[PDB]
A paper describes a structure:
The final step in the pathway is catalyzed by a 2-epimerase, which utilizes UDP-2,3-diacetamido-2,3-dideoxy-d-glucuronic acid as its substrate.
Although UDP-GlcNAc was observed binding in structure 4, it was never included in the crystallization trials (structure 10). We reasoned that the D98N variant, for whatever reason, bound the ligand during its overexpression and purification from Escherichia coli. As a consequence, we crystallized the apoform of the D98N variant with the assumption that UDP-GlcNAc would be found in the allosteric pocket. Note that the α-carbons for the apoform of the WT enzyme and the D98N variant correspond with an RMSD of 0.9 Å.
Numbering used by the authors:
A (entry chain B): 2 to 360
B (entry chain A): 1 to 361
The structure:
């Protein structure tokens, strides 16, 4: 009764598509096609990703990437269009806001194949921010806009997109975090290995240039974390670049003052996030995950894209100026929680999307 | 110091718009220009006549792309245009009209953070399945500056959240061009002498579209009507040899005998005939605009036009070809009408206004 073709580029997009698929594959009368724009990866770490996160095997890998925006986008546009002319789907789903997303939407729309944009209406309002142009043009190219927030809805209305193409469904990444959260609790040994209890540690990740490329900020961070560790163990899966910078700056020994690890796989990282007493991070994605698992977050930046998390008191900016102050900030936010309300849907965004598709 | 302004063009109407802008840019200190054509160089006779008569410069680049699907053409043009932008490093990219070339140019530039100005911004049919509608929308939302032809286009842009400070009402550079080529036609074209015609002593017909040329009922209505008009006032009908044979085939060749049926004429000869006609009968959107520019009443043999403003100012009139008697009467009646004396598409100096805005910023 309906053929639904998903275009995905980067890993976040596979995760969103997998969540939607978990609903679509339960729907009798839906045929699904998964088009990956990039290459297959045979490496062990990659195979584990697809397997442990239950990602469907793509029907296509177009192999495109490594070039400029114009080469990657233009080749994807032609190649995706080739697939659409063979598969003739009733719907094309595009996800996130990369060049793959835009290429998928532009390929479909000129063939008059209805396009639905999963994660529509996000705006930085900075036309030069990486994904801002992709966000705007994907949204204006699409037939259905699945917004994660009311702010995104309003963003879309403001640009003259009509209300009847806009549907507030929430963030499928919340759905995915609940699914992987349950699976981690079943499968992950990371807390057993480290000898840690649920709610008995702080998780830290640091990888942004603003922190890792400044000798002074990185010293402040690492010293602050070493001080926090004395009170509550600090688990710090250190990004390899962060490690490299620490070592070059002569800051290596501080990592010996916390539980410093090599990066861990996805399910192990979910297990650490959901069971942390608090998360300290400069990652935008990790800030959202903290909220999804109702774990207080301290963001070691002077700003964040997710102001809604600050307003809801789940997240808290802590610029790394002084090690004592940062440590004390973290220790204090450890005993806070934010507003128990939903910012990004109820974890069932996937069913709401499917409902508008299976019509 | 100076600005490098690179123009992307992909269809003949874009060449005309860019040349009009360029006639101003090249007289203005502090500008270097680069012209990129997405398609091929041609050496047939009619193409050479296009470039020579309409004063179109040979592009600095011909990307040689065309003839494929939307995805093929657009995707290849996007990569190929970007290549040129990385070499030329312009300060501004200008894109024109609303074709796949336009969009490819805008998208190539915007991801390099090269300012884009869209000439002919804000047009909307409000039907996202009309040919160029997605192109219009996406080009508009990709652009840094929007050069709107009408107040309507300005409102369309504001209604999609584009702020007033990026929208400039300049008019339609096609009007500038029509005045340029009109003056040139009056200096150079001898077509009226050649035909023994007097200015305002004839009707011009041009029938281009398949909905008409390929349906024997509609084509008969048109040619039967014209042959009727011809008994009161000469009808000049430059007919493509295709459309001529299509008419011979449907059995209508005696009608082409009655009127002054011609082989295709050159561009300036057509301009000369248009501007000096008592009335123009056409199914071409472009000709409908030229009729208005030259203040010649127009009758459009279709059930619709996009250019509704011409209908509402009474310069144009829809007469779908269902009834030869009534079509002939409509022509005879409308050839003694005029529209409302109003400028719909600017003052004929849209090019100067674009140039002034670009050179300022
Ligand atoms: Cl993504
Ligand atoms: Na609640």
């Amino acid at each position: 009764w309906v053929k639904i073709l998903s275009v995905v580029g980067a890993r976040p997009q596979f995760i969103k598509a997998a969540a939607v698929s978990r609903v679509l594959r339960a729907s009798p009368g839906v045929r699904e096609v998964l088009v990956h724009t990039g290459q297959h990866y045979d490496d062990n770490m990659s195979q584990v990703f697809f397997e442990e996160l239950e990602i469907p095997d793509p029907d296509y890998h177009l192999g495109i990437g490594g070039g400029t925006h114009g080469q990657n986008t233009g080749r994807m546009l032609e190649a995706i269009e080739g697939v659409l002319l063979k598969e003739k789907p009733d719907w094309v789903l595009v996800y996130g806001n990369t060049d793959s997303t835009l290429a998928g939407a532009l390929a479909a729309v000129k063939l008059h194949i209805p396009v639905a944009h999963v994660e529509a209406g996000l705006r930085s309002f900075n036309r030069r921010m990486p994904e801002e142009i992709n966000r705007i043009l994907t949204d204006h190219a699409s037939d259905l806009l699945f917004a994660p927030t009311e702010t995104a809805v309003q963003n879309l209305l403001r640009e003259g997109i009509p209300e009847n193409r806009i549907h507030l469904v929430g963030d499928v990444m919340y759905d995915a975090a609940l699914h992987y959260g349950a699976k981690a609790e079943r499968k992950s040994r990371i807390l057993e290995r480290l000898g840690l209890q649920a709610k008995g540690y702080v998780l830290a990740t640091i990888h942004r240039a603003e922190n890792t490329d400044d000798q002074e900020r990185l010293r402040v961070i690492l010293e602050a974390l070493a001080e926090v560790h004395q009170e509550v163990p600090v688990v710090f899966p250190v990004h390899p670049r962060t490690r490299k910078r620490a070592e070059a700056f002569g800051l290596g020994s501080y990592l010996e003052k916390v539980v410093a690890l090599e990066p861990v796989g996805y399910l192990d990282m979910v297990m650490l996030e959901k069971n942390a007493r608090l998360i300290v991070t400069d990652s935008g994605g990790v800030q959202k995950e903290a909220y999804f698992y109702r774990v207080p977050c301290v963001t070691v930046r002077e700003e964040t894209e997710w102001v809604e998390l600050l307003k809801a008191e789940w997240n808290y900016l802590a610029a790394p100026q002084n090690a004592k102050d940062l440590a004390l900030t973290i220790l204090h936010r450890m005993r806070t929680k934010g507003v128990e309300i939903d910012l990004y849907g109820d974890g069932r965004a996937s069913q709401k999307i499917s409902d508008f598709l299976r019509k």
